[PDB]
């Protein structure tokens, strides 16, 4: 897993600096990942959830660590906080919480040491 400095603007300065491609949406470049995640930018700016930027970036520009090769998804709780605060506004604009980002696909904080998640 070769690490790339994050170049997607809205994912700069979120807690980690390096990502790896392709991401889970099969985007093979950060230009493609950024083109999609920046569609959410209005929701980040209106602050429907303080967790939204980190949650989205943890999927679109997932964390890359120098030696550690295992995946590090966001935690189910982070997703649930973001879905709680932002899915009502999304429905008001005429959309729905994206099916790809259903929180029950995410590991639970501390429930397992075989699948680690990101929260804090």
């Amino acid at each position, epitope marked *: 897993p070769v690490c790339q400095e994050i170049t997607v603007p809205m994912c700069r300065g979120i807690g980690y600096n390096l990502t790896h491609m392709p991401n889970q949406f099969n985007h093979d470049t950060q230009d493609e990942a*950024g*083109l999609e*995640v*920046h*569609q959410f930018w209005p929701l980040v700016e209106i602050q429907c959830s303080p967790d939204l930027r980190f949650f989205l970036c943890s999927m679109y520009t997932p964390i890359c660590l120098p030696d550690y090769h295992k995946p590090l998804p966001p935690c189910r709780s982070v997703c649930e906080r973001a879905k709680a605060g932002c899915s009502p506004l999304m429905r008001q604009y*005429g*959309f*729905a919480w994206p099916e*790809r980002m259903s929180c029950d696909r995410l590991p639970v904080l501390g429930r397992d040491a075989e699948v680690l998640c990101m929260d804090y």
Partner: antibody
């Protein structure tokens, strides 16, 4: 380099059908948002429809809902506007346009427009 | 259904003149208002987004501002190539347009 090119415009009988194409270069449509905007001769701009890859959504203006359908051929990096049951009031120049990157709230790249004439 | 009412519908002004175009939302809206310039036979070109942010490459004489439900596009010094119709746009993800302002150059 980064651009949009439309094709498919021309004459169609009232109640007929016509498919427009919006061919992209320099970015992948399947990770972007493509909108359609039309302009009747001598009139103003009217927003018609849009897809968002982020939301996985397709939205149609009430004036065309039920008659117009969007699809895409990702291998050709081309979006389509399928028009059915065409009316005289659908006569217009049709534009496709990209949702503004990175900041949103607007349409940054536009195709050159193609004229659809609904006449017998 | 938000309505954007644009005024004036047309205007004439000399090179070097200051030109102001106004678009009024029918109800309280956010600053999600954009301005476009459309020249004959061409697609609209984005000038301003989010009421007052200048788009890439847009000349310094264009600017935007808002007061309440009133959004204004200002050309500080009209140039002959600024002949166009100007449109306001409302919306975050789905858009509605004002009816346009035709700007003609007095010479």
């Amino acid at each position: 380099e980064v651009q949009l090119v439309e094709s498919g415009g021309g004459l169609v009988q009232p109640g007929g059908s016509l498919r427009l194409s919006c061919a992209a270069s320099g970015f992948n449509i399947h990770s972007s948002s493509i909108h359609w905007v039309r302009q009747a001769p001598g009139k103003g701009l009217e927003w018609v429809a849009a897809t968002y890859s982020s939301f996985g959504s397709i939205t149609y203006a009430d004036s065309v809902k039920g008659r117009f359908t969007i699809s895409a051929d990702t291998s050709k990096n081309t979006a389509y506007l399928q028009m059915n049951s065409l009316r005289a009031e659908d006569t217009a120049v049709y534009y496709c346009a990209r949702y503004h990157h990175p900041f949103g709230y607007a349409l940054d790249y536009w195709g050159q427009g193609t004229l659809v004439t609904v006449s017998s | 259904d938000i309505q954007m009412t644009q005024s004036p519908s047309s205007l004439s002004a000399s090179v070097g003149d200051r030109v102001t175009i106004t678009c009024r939302a029918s109800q309280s809206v956010s600053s999600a208002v954009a301005w476009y310039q459309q020249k004959p036979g061409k697609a609209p070109k984005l000038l301003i987004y989010s009421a007052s942010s200048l788009y890439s490459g847009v000349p310094s004489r264009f600017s935007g501002s808002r007061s309440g439900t009133d959004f204004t596009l200002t050309i500080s010094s009209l140039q002959p190539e600024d002949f166009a119709t100007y449109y306001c746009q409302q919306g975050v993800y789905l858009f509605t347009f004002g009816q346009g302002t035709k700007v003609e150059i007095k010479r």
